[PDB]
Ligand binder design. Structure first.
Ligand SMILES: COc1cc(C(=O)NC[C@](O)(c2cc(C(C)(C)O)c(F)c(-c3ccc(F)cc3)n2)C(F)(F)F)cc2cc(C)nnc12
Lengths: 1367, 62, 114, 61, 69
């Protein structure tokens, strides 16, 4: 009564242990490694494995193996063979070639619609566009390499598609085939993948994920080849149309093939060699941007890194396949050291591809995904770190003291700067005198006047509580969709029953009876949903009484997903809280956590293995300060005080430890590979923020000792340290030398100081540069950004990033991903064509092979296309599809990337943009000139469309809550439904039965709460959806909703508490109908009768789209007046001129860069980031630190309501109920905390999650520096018309649009215009003044919402908390 | 000059206090937690004390 | 009356000796016992005492030689190389660089024979 | 004078803190079961003492 | 009595003695350990009194705020 839908893309990892377990069983001997995994899988095999082994085909292959007819290989061997699959028949070559030609042709025919509209709208003027006719001529004959990768992808995709379809239909189904991919016989199961190559007499065994990976590899390589091809074709026509990079696909295929050769010679470990190639590329880049001393140093280090890795790979490979069935698969080229020849060739190819061009070199970063992923040896990874974590460290006390001092120094500096005061000290007496003066005066010395002695002195300080912990748990931070390690005693439940000793199996059954359902959940969400003893203060209480220390249930579980660590909920909650408290209260003090010559250099450090180097003595010396600041002990030191006392175990399903007889207690299990104790902290991902701020404190100590300035930035697991030191330049010394010497002197100090805290750095982890930043994987040279855009779209394909193969979601995903080629790659047309290729495949080719819906969705799109054919009087279905894929998804169309996104990133009004988009798209068919005002043509296709948009049967339903949830929602079934809305009922139906009362109570009242909430602002006339949003956010139902929205995004909602991975049919059917209804939405929106034949088709004469949009929104909700949402489409309202007008009357954008092309160059002007004007408000003076973040946010929300709804005639009762309900304070008291807004008009200032805070141009920031804008001419015209009152057109978008389109023009013309003038359509621009919110608020219903969802309220402000605010 | 000498003395004592306090904090490691003496070494903080006050003021109904 | 001055000098000497020890004091991290059956505390002793424990392998550490050189505030050979003015190539890297320099197709590699 | 006295008074409290920390370190550095249990039990008694003092103050009225 | 500073000398002697006592503790095993833990002052009571003093000082601040309710 359920189905199992498997992944179509790799989402997890390729388990070494799984592959080994399966292969070892099948061939009755060690496969990838001789360890416990291969021993146990043979002794007591899994059913899933037995099923594969017992197949008649498998038995035949096994016999051939044992008879010595065929040889066993590692999957990497096959990866190469698959990727080199050239065994295509003429019919295969023709069929695939014709398919590819068709897809390319269609993608261009599709892009033609937008390109036409854009060129027409700009005025730059089956295919109408001259540009694309030329392109089609070039792309009518795909290269053999593209076909090669396309074919392979297609075949692997077909293999998986057949499997996935059949698995849904028949659980346990195994796909056995040898026809789809000639020469290769596959046996596919979600529990394994056996591949046999007949002609070569070779067999390999891997897992499902490896198969997915092979497909993902062919797809990634396909996308690289495809993008490259498109880019090259575009660049051939016009150097500005394609990507900045330019690759020879011949080199790219050789790189791919050589990389596979490396993986073929170096089995699994060969990935180490590939990994180090990043250094090679970085070196090639540095060889361009750096000075001789800096580039030489890096280069040599880089080569050593690669060769050392290669030698390591050889050592590990040879030692691994020593006693395994793969001992005879080692190439003589490894033994003879010939692999170095293969390597030199591979690297040369990379250098050739780079072609000393930073544009190519940055893009080549795709090479680290293009080869797939290594099999993860979970046990080896465990052992690899064990050695660093059982290690004893030694420190000088002065080292530790100075570091603690530096930490405190920063805390004090932070407090003095942020709260205008020192932290309270419980031992101020430790300070000498100079420091007492600083304390008394609430000041601090700069580092330049600070000494090491002083840091030691500061290290002696102790504090009184300055901050507060939340008393109630924020379920948003705690509830997630991840797995949770079971309690220590139930750790064995993580392994297959057959892999456990009989004593363990019996003990598991006995132990389960001693644990709660929340303990046995194995999942985070379920952990909490099943907790029938849960209360809001459990975490607070546990923290205060340190219930997590010496806790017998504590265990650390590792899985391959870089060795993801899990611990039982109790501990997870503490780990999360400690990080959250740092994030909200502490990081505010660490903003970077987010002579005749001054020498400068930069030290770039990989901190990924830094975590392992931390010890209680080095980290908790600082975390103890945080403990004091929060008045809590052991909260921020929880890790080092707990981890050493627990066993660290690899819990991957197929990687069990060997357990001695009668040993049940994990802590009494013999240490072994993949299992050990006494891990002295350093668990990656835990206490990450703590370690980050500790690193900063160390850097301050370094800058002090080295007598130089540090401007550091830390991001994730790496940091960039910019060092500046004024020196007396020596005779004969140049700047480059001074900088190099600085780097060396500073590097030596840095290494010493890090070593001084137990962290040993390596030349493999740390490197130096002069003045260039390559941090965050963004290459910037001389201020110019050199993107790696291809890397971001490698995985674009049919059912990408979607659940249950949700069609609309995958379209949006393709849209979003391919957008990167335009936003970073700076190629509108390349992104468009590439996008259309995959959207086409997704809708036209793959839609008919849906895993769950078969061809139902396809049949529905056909109905839509037939419908469109009739509605728009089109010639055929192919045309109907061409149109469909260009229509807004908002209207049930297939276009995930509205045209406005090509010019600016954010809009406050999607409806208006969707309408304009459709107008622009339809002009393709109606031949309407977009350079003119809309006028009635003999072709009424557009008027029919617009008529259908505005004319419809009104059907409002729960309009206020819908707007609260989504202020831009339309209602009356005029928009596609989303999973969040469709599944919300299913979620509440499940939650209402949860053991955990907090959730079940909320869920049970969910419907009534929604109703009460709807009928809350229903009496306010000038409805302001963003105002409603604030009201909503200020209420506890908001948090309740977030939990529901979290859950609603999963699969098999109805089986959440059923402890199964199976997908309920109920969910399959609901999702099916959901998708079908959304596909046919376009039919419902555009009826053939125009919603009434007695309704004259809308005339466009003097028609304002802005007004139309407003009307539609109001009609759809049956509201008299909706304000603050409707906004003119800048793309529609601005008429673009490329000349000097008699009167400017518009925005003038000028090119300051002297060159005809600006792409790839930085100019003299400041970068444009949109930047919405902030809120102008007076902040009341009080001790903010007395409040938690959550209650401060609540105060800020109420202040916003006080601001916006100041005009409601029930304001006082409204604010009083809210204040008492959510804070506990009276309005008069709360008002003293509320920011006082000095801004009269909130309509363009109010900050809500529903409104963009920035309106950036659809262009790299560096590229905006080449342009200057002048909005004066237009400001004057607008001032004279609106009398200095606000208007509904966004200022930032007006500018952003101009900047982006100037780039777009360059792309299409190969000439960047000297100036662009944007002349607005004044009839599209309306006065936007703040409304008078007449009408009252339903206080009764307000109270009801607060009460019903009381369990989601934030901490209230107690009298003891309130009084402290004003001391 | 007596005050000047005392100030140098005071600074050295401050430096000593710094070193020793860091030492105390570093010393109160995982093993101090194991034996239940970490709080003794570091000191009690407000929230632990508030819990104590709460218990003290509510041992029964008072 | 120079008796007060003399007393203050004695005070300074004691403070100097106390600081002398503290600035020459080394803290060993808490860690696993030999034959790992528990965790020893973060023993604290003087620089020389900790160095001898490292030298004689009384405490379990990996980079025995570096830990000693570091606590002695001396520059080790490894540190000198890692932070050298010029980075040398490993023999394998020398060969690779020799192959990389000179695109004369000297690789002479046959992939078809793999 | 008063400036000298004030400095001497501050020195005395610093010395007290130094000895306090050293007592903590010297006592903690001794980790037999008896010493450690003695410390833990003393802390239990400490909690109880604070409770009784707090209860007492709460009964002034 | 300016010469009262002799009390500092007295305390510094104890302080240095305690510092020595602390560091020599690591020399116990295999060398200066005839039984388990040799004779030392062992005045945990002083540690406890410092804890009591500090904990109550903190308690006084907490009450000082409760007093405002
Ligand atoms: C941040 O979010 C928003 C901003 C704006 C916005 O920026 N409105 C323009 C503004 O009111 C103005 C006044 C004058 C007046 C008439 C007062 O002079 C102007 F002229 C101009 C102006 C125009 C274009 C141009 F090229 C130069 C100037 N802009 C502004 F004040 F907010 F900017 C409108 C929104 C509408 C909605 C529905 N949601 N969010 C909005």
């Amino acid at each position: 009564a359920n189905v199992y839908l498997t992944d179509s893309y790799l989402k997890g990892v390729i388990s070494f242990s799984e592959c080994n377990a399966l292969g070892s069983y099948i061939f009755n001997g060690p496969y990838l490694k001789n360890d416990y995994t291969n021993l146990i899988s043979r002794q007591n095999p899994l059913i899933e494995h037995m099923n594969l082994k017992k197949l008649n085909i498998t038995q035949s292959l096994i016999s051939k193996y044992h008879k010595g007819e065929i040889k066993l290989e590692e999957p990497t061997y096959f990866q190469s063979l698959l990727m080199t699959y050239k065994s295509m028949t003429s019919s295969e070559q023709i069929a695939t070639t014709n398919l590819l030609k068709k897809i390319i042709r269609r993608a261009i025919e599709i892009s033609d619609v937008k390109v036409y509209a854009i060129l027409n709208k700009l005025g730059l003027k089956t295919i109408k566009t001259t540009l694309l006719k030329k392109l089609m001529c070039s792309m009518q004959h795909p290269p053999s390499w593209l076909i090669h990768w396309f074919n392979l992808y297609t075949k692997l995709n077909n293999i998986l598609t057949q499997y996935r379809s059949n698995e849904v239909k028949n659980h346990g189904f195994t796909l056995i085939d040898n026809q789809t991919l000639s020469g290769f016989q596959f046996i596919l199961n979600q529990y394994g993948c056996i591949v046999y190559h007949k002609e070569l007499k070779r067999i390999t065994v891997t897992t499902y994920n490896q198969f997915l990976t092979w497909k993902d590899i062919s797809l990634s390589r396909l996308n690289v080849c495809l993008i490259t091809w498109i880019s090259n074709c575009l660049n051939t026509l016009n150097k500005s149309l394609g990507l900045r990079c330019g690759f020879n696909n011949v080199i790219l295929t050789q790189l791919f093939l050589y990389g596979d050769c490396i993986l073929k010679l170096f089995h699994n470990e060969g990935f180490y060699i590939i990994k180090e190639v990043e250094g090679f590329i970085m070196s090639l880049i540095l060889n361009i941007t750096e000075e001789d001393q800096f580039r030489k140093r890096f280069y040599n280090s880089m080569l050593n890194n690669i060769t050392d890795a290669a030698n390591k790979a050889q050592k590990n490979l040879l030692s691994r396949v020593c006693h395994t069935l793969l001992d005879k698969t080692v190439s003589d080229n490894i033994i003879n050291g010939r692999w170095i020849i293969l390597l030199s060739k591979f690297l040369k190819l990379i250098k050739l591809a780079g072609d000393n061009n930073l544009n190519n070199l940055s893009e080549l970063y795709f090479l680290f995904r293009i080869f797939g992923h290594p099999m993860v040896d979970e046990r080896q990874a465990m052992d690899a770190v064990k050695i660093n974590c059982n290690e004893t460290k030694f420190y000088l006390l002065s080292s530790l003291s100075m570091l603690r001092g530096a930490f405190i120094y920063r805390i004090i500096k932070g407090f003095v700067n942020n709260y205008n005061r020192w932290p309270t000290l419980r031992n101020a007496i430790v300070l000498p005198l100079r420091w007492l003066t600083y304390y008394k005066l609430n000041t601090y010395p700069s580092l330049l006047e600070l000494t090491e002695r002083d840091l030691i002195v500061l290290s002696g300080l102790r504090f009184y509580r300055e901050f507060r912990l939340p008393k109630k748990v924020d379920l948003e931070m705690i509830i997630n969709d991840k797995a949770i390690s079971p309690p220590k005693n139930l750790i064995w439940t993580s392994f297959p029953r057959n892999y456990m000793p009989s004593h363990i199996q019996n003990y598991i059954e006995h132990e389960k009876l001693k644990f709660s359902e929340s303990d046995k959940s194995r999942r985070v969400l379920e952990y909490y949903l099943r907790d029938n003893k849960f209360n809001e203060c459990d975490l607070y209480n546990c923290v205060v009484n340190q219930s997590y220390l010496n806790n017998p249930n504590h265990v650390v579980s590792l899985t391959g997903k870089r060795m993801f660590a899990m611990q039982p909920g109790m501990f997870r909650q503490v780990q999360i809280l400690a990080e959250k408290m740092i994030a909200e209260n502490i990081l505010q003090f660490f903003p970077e956590s987010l002579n005749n010559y001054i020498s400068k250099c930069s030290i770039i450090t990989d901190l990924s293995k830094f975590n392992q180097a931390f010890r209680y003595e080095t980290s908790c010396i600082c975390s103890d300060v945080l403990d004091e600041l929060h008045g809590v002990q052991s909260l921020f030191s929880w890790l080092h005080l707990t981890i050493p006392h627990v066993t660290i175990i690899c819990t991957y399903r197929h990687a069990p430890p060997y357990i001695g007889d009668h040993i049940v207690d994990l802590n009494n299990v013999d240490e072994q590979s993949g299992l050990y104790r006494y891990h002295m902290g350093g668990i990656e991902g835990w206490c990450q923020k703590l370690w980050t701020i500790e690193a900063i404190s160390l850097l301050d100590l370094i800058s002090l000792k080295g007598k130089f300035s540090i401007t550091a930035l830390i991001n994730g697991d790496n940091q960039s340290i910019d060092i500046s030191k004024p020196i007396r330049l020596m005779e004969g010394q140049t700047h480059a030398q001074a900088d190099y010497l600085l780097a060396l002197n500073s590097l030596k100090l840095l290494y010493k100081e890090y070593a001084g805290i137990g962290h040993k750095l390596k030349g493999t982890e740390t490197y130096i540069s002069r003045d260039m930043q390559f941090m965050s994987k963004t290459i910037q040279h001389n201020g110019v950004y050199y993107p790696a855009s291809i890397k971001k779209v490698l995985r674009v394909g049919p059912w990408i990033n979607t659940i249950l193969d949700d069609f609309k979601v995958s379209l949006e995903s393709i849209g979003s991903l391919t957008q990167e080629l335009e936003y970073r790659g700076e190629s509108l047309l390349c992104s468009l064509i590439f996008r259309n290729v995959w959207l086409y495949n997704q809708i036209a080719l793959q839609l008919k092979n849906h895993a769950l819906c078969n061809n139902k969705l396809y049949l529905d799109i056909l109905k839509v296309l037939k419908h469109l054919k009739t509605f728009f009087n089109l010639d055929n279905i192919d045309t109907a599809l061409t149109l469909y894929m260009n229509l807004p998804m908002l209207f049930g169309g297939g276009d995930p990337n509205l045209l406005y996104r090509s010019f600016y990133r954010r809009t406050p009004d999607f409806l208006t943009e969707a309408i304009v988009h459709s107008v622009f798209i339809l002009s393709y068919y109606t031949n309407h000139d977009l350079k003119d005002k809309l006028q009635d043509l003999s072709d009424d296709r557009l008027n029919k469309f617009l008529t259908c948009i505005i004319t419809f049967d009104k059907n409002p339903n729960a309009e206020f809550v819908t707007l609260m949830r989504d202020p831009q929602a339309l209602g009356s079934e005029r928009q596609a439904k989303i999973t969040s809305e469709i599944n919300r009922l299913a979620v509440t139906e499940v939650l209402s039965t949860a053991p955990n009362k907090i959730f079940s109570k909320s869920a049970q009242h969910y419907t009534t709460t929604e109703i009460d909430l709807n009928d809350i602002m229903q009496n306010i006339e000038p409805t302001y959806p963003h105002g409603l949003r604030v009201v909503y956010e200020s209420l506890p139902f908001y948090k309740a909703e977030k939990i529901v929205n979290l859950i609603s995004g999963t699969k098999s909602i109805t089986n959440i508490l059923e402890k199964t991975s199976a997908i309920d049919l109920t969910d399959i059917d609901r999702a099916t109908e959901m998708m079908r209804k959304n596909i046919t939405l376009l039919i419902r929106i555009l009826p053939l009768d125009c919603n009434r034949d007695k309704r004259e088709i809308l005339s466009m004469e003097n028609l304002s789209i802005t007004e139309l949009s407003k009307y539609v929104r109001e009609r759809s909700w049956s509201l008299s007046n909706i304000v603050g949402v409707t906004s003119p489409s800048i793309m529609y309202t601005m008429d673009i001129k490329y000349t000097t007008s008699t009167i400017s009357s518009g925005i003038i954008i000028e090119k300051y860069n002297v060159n005809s092309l600006t792409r790839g160059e930085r100019g003299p002007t400041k970068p444009w980031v949109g930047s919405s004007t902030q809120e102008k408000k007076t902040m009341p003076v009080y001790n903010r630190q007395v409040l938690t973040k959550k209650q401060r946010d609540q105060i800020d929300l109420l202040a916003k309501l006080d601001w916006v709804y100041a005009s409601i005639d029930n304001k006082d009762e409204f604010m009083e109920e809210l204040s008492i309900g959510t804070l506990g304070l009276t309005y008069e008291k709360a008002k003293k905390l509320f920011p006082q807004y000095l801004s009269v008009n909130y309509l363009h200032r109010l900050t809500v999650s529903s409104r963009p805070c920035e309106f950036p141009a659809s262009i790299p920031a560096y590229r905006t520096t080449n342009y200057h804008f002048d909005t004066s001419p237009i400001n004057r015209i607008l001032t004279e018309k609106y009398g200095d009152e606000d208007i509904d057109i966004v200022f930032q978008n007006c500018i952003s649009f101009g900047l982006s389109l100037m780039s777009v023009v360059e792309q299409f013309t190969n000439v960047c215009p000297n100036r662009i003038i944007l002349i607005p359509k004044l009839n599209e621009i309306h006065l936007m003044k703040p409304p008078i919110f007449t009408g009252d608020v339903d206080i009764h219903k307000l109270k009801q919402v607060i009460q019903k969802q009381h369990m989601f309220l934030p901490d209230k402000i107690s009298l003891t908390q309130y009084v402290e605010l004003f001391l | 000059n007596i005050t000047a000498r005392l100030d140098r003395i005071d600074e050295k004592l401050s430096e000593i206090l710094g070193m020793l306090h860091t030492l105390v904090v570093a010393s109160a490691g995982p093993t101090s937690a194991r034996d239940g003496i970490r709080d003794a070494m570091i000191g009690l903080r407000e929230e632990m004390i508030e819990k104590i006050r709460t218990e003290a003021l509510m041992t029964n109904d008072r």
